[PDB]
């Protein structure tokens, strides 16, 4: 639609993560490529990223090459950009045919010349929301009657930003012309909630004039979003495009989204990422497993139960992948990649265990993390 700004939203691709792993080495490149491919196939007006583009502060030559190759092949082309800039931006360059402009803030992993400066200098990404006293200035875009005021705050040490907000040292700049017509979009890369009272960014701290908050840094996919009643805005945490640890947060299926803006209204469409390796986690408390009698030489029974839980997790992972592809397990069809499987086992109350590497070895050629399938702990 001529009055609908269509933005592909994602965050935390971590290009280069696990590059050296023989099984997982290409995951970050394939999934960062997927995000750009979906944007092109779905004919969006622009891409908006929430930071942590590269895993390493100084990306490897392979990581940089792969990111540049994907951006060049998916973002350049004959497609006209229908976004009018009201207040340099790559699509306005007369020597580069930008079909889909990419906008990104920096995260803490992409810390004078960041890897993001390199993406910008090539004309492939618009690095915005720089934090050199913080002055948050918008990028003003128009498509028909729709007016977008895009704001960004690049990653700042959580305590430093929290103190800056407390000492009222954060300056949000608003356009005077077409005052209340602008759809206000904020992009951040901070902790959404931490044990420390100063290590995170509370939602209440964010100005209520904002309509939408794109929340980077947090890897868990919470793509459906959450409404803040006091501030009157809807926070969307798209999550990462790769699991950077085997944490419970990393298990939620990865998605990107299309944010459709018509006037001051929006429609968020969620898109399941097909290239993300399945990750299943099981949290087990042995004392809650009646089958296993406590305080006796129960290794055999502990092992039988845990082996059955890995098997169950593999079956769920394979099913999760076929679901993502819209396919069935048949000879003509591509087979799922090896899944990431993790059992967290609480062994309190008298239960014998097994060496984690010896346990993991029981699933060689069946799991992507053949070294750390199980973790035994005491509550």
């Amino acid at each position: 639609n001529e009055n609908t700004i269509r933005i592909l939203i994602s965050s935390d691709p971590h290009v280069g993560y696990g590059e050296k792993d023989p099984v997982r080495g290409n995951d970050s490149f394939v999934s960062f490529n997927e995000i750009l491919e979906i944007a092109r196939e779905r004919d969006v007006d622009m891409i908006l990223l929430g930071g942590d583009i590269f895993h390493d502060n100084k990306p490897s030559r392979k990581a940089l090459y792969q990111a540049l190759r994907s951006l060049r092949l998916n973002c350049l082309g004959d497609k006209p950009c229908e976004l009018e800039l009201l207040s340099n931006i790559n699509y306005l360059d007369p020597n580069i045919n930008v079909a889909i402009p990419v906008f990104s803030i920096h995260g803490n992993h992409d810390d004078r010349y960041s890897a993001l400066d390199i993406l910008q200098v090539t004309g492939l990404v618009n690095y915005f929301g720089r934090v050199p006293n913080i002055v948050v200035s918008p990028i003003l875009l128009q498509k028909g009657f729709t007016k977008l005021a895009l704001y960004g705050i690049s990653n700042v040490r959580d305590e430093r930003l929290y103190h800056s907000f407390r000492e009222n040292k954060v300056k949000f700049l608003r356009p005077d012309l077409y005052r209340d017509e602008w759809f206000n979009l904020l992009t951040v890369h901070q902790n959404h909630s931490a044990h420390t009272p100063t290590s995170y960014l509370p939602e209440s701290f964010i100005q209520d004039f904002y309509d939408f908050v794109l929340w980077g840094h947090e890897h868990e996919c919470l793509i459906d979003g959450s409404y803040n009643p006091t501030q009157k805005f809807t926070v969307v945490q798209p999550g990462s495009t790769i699991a950077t640890s085997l944490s419970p947060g990393e298990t939620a299926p990865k998605h990107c989204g299309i944010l459709n803006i018509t006037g001051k209204d929006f429609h968020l469409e969620k898109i399941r990422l097909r290239t993300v390796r399945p990750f299943i986690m099981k949290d087990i408390i042995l004392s809650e497993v009646s089958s296993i009698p406590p305080m006796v030489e129960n290794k055999k029974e502990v092992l039988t139960y845990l082996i059955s839980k890995v098997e169950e997790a593999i079956t769920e992972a394979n099913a999760q992948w076929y679901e993502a592809q819209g396919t069935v397990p048949v000879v003509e069809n591509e087979k799922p990649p090896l899944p990431l499987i993790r059992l967290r086992v609480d062994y309190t109350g008298g239960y014998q265990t097994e060496n984690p590497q010896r346990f993991s070895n029981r699933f060689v050629g069946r799991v992507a993390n053949a070294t750390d399938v199980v973790q035994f702990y005491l509550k």
Binding site: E84, P175, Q207, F209
Partner: peptide, 21 residues
């Protein structure tokens, strides 16, 4: 933290491509 709100300050200020071949 849940108490304070709207921290900092809020103040006011005053085809589309050029490629061809």
């Amino acid at each position: 933290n849940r108490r304070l709100r709207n921290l900092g300050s809020v103040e006011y200020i005053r085809n589309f491509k050029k490629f061809q071949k």
